[PDB]
Amino acid sequence: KRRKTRKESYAIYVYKVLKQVHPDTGISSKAMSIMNSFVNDVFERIAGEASRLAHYNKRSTITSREIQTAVRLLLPGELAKHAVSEGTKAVTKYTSAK
Amino acid sequence: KRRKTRKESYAIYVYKVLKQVHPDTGISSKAMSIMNSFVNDVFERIAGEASRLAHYNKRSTITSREIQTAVRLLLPGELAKHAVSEGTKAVTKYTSAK
Amino acid sequence: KTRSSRAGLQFPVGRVHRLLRKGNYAERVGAGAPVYLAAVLEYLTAEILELAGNAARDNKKTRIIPRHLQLAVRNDEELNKLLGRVTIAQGGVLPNIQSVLLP
Amino acid sequence: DNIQGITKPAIRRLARRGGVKRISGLIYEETRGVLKVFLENVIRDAVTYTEHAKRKTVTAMDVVYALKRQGRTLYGFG
Amino acid sequence: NIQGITKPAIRRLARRGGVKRISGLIYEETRGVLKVFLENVIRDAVTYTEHAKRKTVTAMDVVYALKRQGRTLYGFG
Amino acid sequence: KPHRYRPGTVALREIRRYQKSTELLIRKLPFQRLVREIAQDFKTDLRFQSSAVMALQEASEAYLVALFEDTNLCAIHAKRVTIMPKDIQLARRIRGER
Amino acid sequence: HRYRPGTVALREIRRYQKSTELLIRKLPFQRLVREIAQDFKTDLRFQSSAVMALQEASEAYLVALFEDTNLCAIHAKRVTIMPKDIQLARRIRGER
DNA sequence: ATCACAGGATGTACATATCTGACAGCTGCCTGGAGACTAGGGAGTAATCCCCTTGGCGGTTAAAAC
DNA sequence: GTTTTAACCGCCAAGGGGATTACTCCCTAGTCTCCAGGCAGCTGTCAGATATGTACATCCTGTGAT
């Protein structure tokens, strides 16, 4: 009768990224749930690190610099530098557009 | 003649508690710093556990029962039950007063 | 026009911004912070999905299953370090047999 | 007396997945005790989470939160 | 400067740990382990300092670096 | 003379089979009964979702497999190929659970 | 007069478990910290308290590692710690 | 007389055909994200101070090296 | 046990920069309106699970042998 209350997940974005990296490969429901949980966990980790960074520096705003430092502190080695490059590219493009 | 900035610490309250539990006993500066760091760490732990408890239940207010659940989750057994007893007694007395 | 399209990202910048605002992380959230976080999340997802797709193709499968994700995570050194204390359901373990136990 | 439900073949299979080639006969009781302790901790945290929510049903999310609190994050259950 | 952690210092550290007999190859392994641990902690501390736009590594930076690695240290703020 | 594999071929075959597979190795009903019996000591008349029991079983099996890998490493350290309770105790003591 | 091989080891164990002062010399450890930090950022300065905290953390970590290494050595029916004991301890801990 | 093959037995990887149910795509809609403004204070920047970090230097001896 | 050396301590000196204060501006919270991106719901169909028979892979013991 009544539709279930909507529950937001990262399924469609993960599917788009998968189609970008593997046009012919699909994904199962359990794997999609695992990917969604991974995204949530990484988001929580980075956001908590950025919040702690802002608190340590007596700042009231989380900006690109705080997230970038959180990424450098949380991701190991090549993952950190590649994520930094991708994020700086995205921020530069976003500020270049509007 | 530049007065140093105000740095808040739990030193006076720890000293009062020490005089309550041991009247003829002192505490060094390093031990006082260690106790202050312990108080800060436990405060952060309980506050974070209460915050995630509130977020999980989709609540916006940290109440006495959230702190109680955080204490029950974080403390090992008899410590947890005695801390809960002390907290409930303090809350009851505060509510009774005004 | 979505903020994700401006940054050339597939992850939702607006949803990340709302979660940052409503996640009790700071009093204010910057404009570029959700963009940067969405880019990082998209990159990590792309890395894991690429490795999992490689594993699936190596196992003659076209759909990624939890076993492929577990293999991808534990075969990549940095990804294994990032998810060291993470358990993937139905992922199993790697085929590791100690050399002393072999015949 | 449900700890005996974790039979010797189950512990042997778990050891084989862990790479164990030869198992002593006293391993099973120790494994059962360790499993009981671990389940006691996780279930205690899960029941605490459920009681805080004023619920009578232990949910998968409660178990996930309990595992995360103990540094044993689990993926695939929300 | 890793050689500055002399053999008697490692022996003293082992004695505090209850070690009675020490092999001759323990010292290089201990130096390597200490170097790795210090590299990680110092890298995190320098990252914290750089985020603060400071040029002096403070005790709070080291404390935060240790706390991030699950090694909370009391007595320094 | 009936065919008999030597004592250790079948063990290695089992190792390979159970490392290639991903299904749960403990029977579902006994584990559910054990979970309910343990939960009886914390709160009476508790109900359990199926996903909760599945997650508990997954976590328990992962923990037991990791503990058994550590136990095998400890037994190999002692120049043995047989795991013993002392190996498990050493592994749990080094991990920091005892 | 000569003590038997192990009396002085036990005496030192008791002495250093009674004591609480740092066991590594301050200047070599500070030089090692500066050398390690040089690879991360140049012209870095260090507070004295930062180096003291680093020394305390490093010594505590090494003492715990040596305790685990001693336990590993005892497990192998030995009284001498070996590099394989340290490697086993770090592998069980989840560091290598 | 102790050591390579011979061959038998067992298991497992490998085509091949059915079938099914779970995954991928389409649809309706509604709620959350985007556009367009204003207010205000959080933060960027400049000036200053002093303190606390760094550098040096000689003597002692405890500790390191052998 | 003997020989060497640099850690430590006390002292002095210079200045780099951490911390503070003032100012100001522009970036984000807040609000209103609007619309379309994403979510629940169906639904079809093909990827994989399930037999099923078969071709090796491998193990193990007898046995011939240099």
UniProtKB/Swiss-Prot annotation, chains A, B:
Glycans are attached at S85. Monoubiquitination of Lys-93 by BRE1 gives a specific tag for epigenetic transcriptional activation and is also prerequisite for histone H3 'Lys-4' and 'Lys-79' methylation. It is found in: Nucleus; Chromosome. GO terms for cellular component: nucleosome; nucleus. It comes from the Eukaryota. Keywords: Acetylation, Chromosome, DNA-binding, Glycoprotein, Isopeptide bond, Nucleosome core, Nucleus, Phosphoprotein, Ubl conjugation. There is a cross-link at K93 (Glycyl lysine isopeptide (Lys-Gly) (interchain with G-Cter in ubiquitin)). GO terms for molecular function: DNA binding; protein heterodimerization activity; structural constituent of chromatin. Belongs to the histone H2B family. The nucleosome is a histone octamer containing two molecules each of H2A, H2B, H3 and H4 assembled in one H3-H4 heterotetramer and two H2A-H2B heterodimers. The octamer wraps approximately 147 bp of DNA. Core component of nucleosome. Nucleosomes wrap and compact DNA into chromatin, limiting DNA accessibility to the cellular machineries which require DNA as a template. Histones thereby play a central role in transcription regulation, DNA repair, DNA replication and chromosomal stability. DNA accessibility is regulated via a complex set of post-translational modifications of histones, also called histone code, and nucleosome remodeling. This is Histone H2B 1.1. The chain holds residues 29 to 126 of 126 of the full protein.
Curated annotation (Swiss-Prot), chain C:
GO terms for cellular component: nucleosome; nucleus. It is found in: Nucleus; Chromosome. Its main location: nucleus. The modification N5-methylglutamine is found at Q90. GO terms for molecular function: DNA binding; protein heterodimerization activity; structural constituent of chromatin. The modification N6-succinyllysine is found at K81. The modification N6-(2-hydroxyisobutyryl)lysine is found at K22, K60, K61, K81. Following DNA double-strand breaks (DSBs), it is ubiquitinated through 'Lys-63' linkage of ubiquitin moieties, leading to the recruitment of repair proteins to sites of DNA damage. H2AK119Ub and ionizing radiation-induced 'Lys-63'-linked ubiquitination are distinct events. Glutamine methylation at Gln-90 (H2AQ104me) by FBL is specifically dedicated to polymerase I. It is present at 35S ribosomal DNA locus and impairs binding of the FACT complex. GO terms for biological process: heterochromatin formation. Belongs to the histone H2A family. This is Histone H2A type 1. It comes from Xenopus laevis (African clawed frog). The lineage of its organism: Eukaryota, Metazoa, Chordata, Craniata, Vertebrata. The chain holds residues 16 to 118 of 130 of the full protein.
UniProtKB/Swiss-Prot annotation, chain D:
The modification N6-succinyllysine is found at K8, K54, K68. The modification Phosphotyrosine is found at Y28, Y65. The modification Phosphoserine is found at S24. The modification N6-(2-hydroxyisobutyryl)lysine is found at K8, K21, K36, K54, K56, K68. The modification N6-glutaryllysine is found at K8, K36, K54, K56, K68. One of its GO terms (biological process) is nucleosome assembly. There is a cross-link at K8 (Glycyl lysine isopeptide (Lys-Gly) (interchain with G-Cter in UFM1)). Demethylation is performed by JMJD6. Monomethylation is performed by KMT5A/SET8. Trimethylation is performed by KMT5B and KMT5C and induces gene silencing. The modification N6-acetyllysine is found at K8, K36, K56, K68. The modification N6-lactoyllysine is found at K8, K54, K68. The modification N6-butyryllysine is found at K8, K21, K54, K56, K68. Keywords: Acetylation, Chromosome, Citrullination, DNA-binding, Hydroxylation, Isopeptide bond, Methylation, Nucleosome core, Nucleus, Phosphoprotein, Ubl conjugation. This is Histone H4. The lineage of its organism: Eukaryota, Metazoa, Chordata, Craniata, Vertebrata. The chain holds residues 25 to 102 of 103 of the full protein.
Swiss-Prot record, chain F:
The modification N6-glutaryllysine is found at K20, K43, K79, K86. The modification N6-lactoyllysine is found at K20, K43. The modification N6-crotonyllysine is found at K20. The modification Phosphothreonine is found at T44, T71. The modification N6-(2-hydroxyisobutyryl)lysine is found at K20, K28, K43, K86. One of its GO terms (cellular component) is nucleoplasm. It is found in: Nucleus; Chromosome. The modification N6,N6,N6-trimethyllysine is found at K20, K43. The modification N6-acetyllysine is found at K20, K43, K79, K86. A lipid is attached at C74 (S-palmitoyl cysteine). The modification Phosphotyrosine is found at Y5. It comes from the Eukaryota. The modification N6-succinyllysine is found at K20, K43, K86. The modification N6,N6-dimethyllysine is found at K43. The modification N6-methyllysine is found at K1, K20, K28, K43, K86. One of its GO terms (molecular function) is protein heterodimerization activity. Keywords: Acetylation, ADP-ribosylation, Chromosome, Citrullination, DNA-binding, Hydroxylation, Lipoprotein, Methylation, Nucleosome core, Nucleus, Palmitate, Phosphoprotein, Ubl conjugation. The modification Phosphoserine is found at S21, S50. Acetylation is generally linked to gene activation. Acetylation at Lys-86 (H3K122ac) by EP300/p300 plays a central role in chromatin structure: localizes at the surface of the histone octamer and stimulates transcription, possibly by promoting nucleosome instability. H3R2me2a is present at the 3' of genes regardless of their transcription state and is enriched on inactive promoters, while it is absent on active promoters. Core component of nucleosome. Nucleosomes wrap and compact DNA into chromatin, limiting DNA accessibility to the cellular machineries which require DNA as a template. Histones thereby play a central role in transcription regulation, DNA repair, DNA replication and chromosomal stability. DNA accessibility is regulated via a complex set of post-translational modifications of histones, also called histone code, and nucleosome remodeling.
